[PDB]
Amino acid sequence: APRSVDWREKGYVTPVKNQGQCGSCWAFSATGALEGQMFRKTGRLISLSEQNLVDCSGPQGNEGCNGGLMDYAFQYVQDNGGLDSEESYPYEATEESCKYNPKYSVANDAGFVDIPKQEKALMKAVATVGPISVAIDAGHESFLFYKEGIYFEPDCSSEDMDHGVLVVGYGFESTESDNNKYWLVKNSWGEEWGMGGYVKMAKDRRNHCGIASAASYPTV
Ligand SMILES: *[C@@H](O)[C@H](C[C@@H]1CCNC1=O)NC(=O)[C@H](CC(C)C)NC(=O)OCc1ccccc1
Ligand code: NA
């Protein structure tokens, strides 16, 4: 596998979004992964509607601003036969009744793939598929104030994840401790957070923060 991967430079990744004060991280992770796979297939990068997922994917098991799962989101798009664009169905940061309109659908999928729970298996997926939806333990003050460098939190759990994000690559940089590898992760907390909305998460460090514990992507 490659030593460094960045799908943003290949055109797979839309700009950083902001979920506001709604527990909809799962919807942004899922649209991010489906935005990448749709571009892989059509060569067109179109931002997808998280509000569509928040409002409409309850029958698949999601609960709006109170949480959800990326796999449930991919199942909705398959069961529903489409997903509306961000411009047609914009984000309001609040759960409402479903307003899906197939005329404005711009995405489809035919299921999803669950990656084995090993950082080695994740590395392979990122290297060959595109951006990957993942879950992490983001519940630590150090994650809120992250600015730069490789993030490592000694009391992060790898069993208890609470936040869905998007791995868009991986790489390295020399560090004091010689733990130099990282996952490149796109968040949904706006541009102001982290490094332009991104974070470098420690890689090959005992599945840090559970990044490899619930990874998946849609099949288009
Ligand atoms: C991210 O914004 C969100 C925060 C949650 C929801 C409101 N309070 C929170 O702490 N995280 C999730 O939605 C999270 C993402 C996973 C990929 C880790 N999932 C979640 O909280 O799921 C709860 C749930 C489990 C099973 C079925 C339905 C809901
Ligand atoms: Na924790």
Residue numbers in the entry: 1 to 220
What does the published report state?
Several drug screening campaigns identified Calpeptin as a drug candidate against SARS-CoV-2. All three compounds bind in a highly similar manner to the catalytic site of each protease.
The catalytic dyad of the active site are Cys25 in the L-domain and His163 in the R-domain. Both Calpeptin and the GC-376 aldehyde bind covalently via the aldehyde group to Cys25, forming a thiohemiacetal, exhibiting the same binding mode. In the Calpeptin structure the norleucine side chain forms hydrophobic contacts to Gly23 and Asn66. The analog 2-oxopyrrolidine group of GC-376 shows also hydrophobic interactions with these residues. The central leucine side chains of both compounds are covered in the hydrophobic S2-pocket formed by Leu69, Met70 and Ala135.
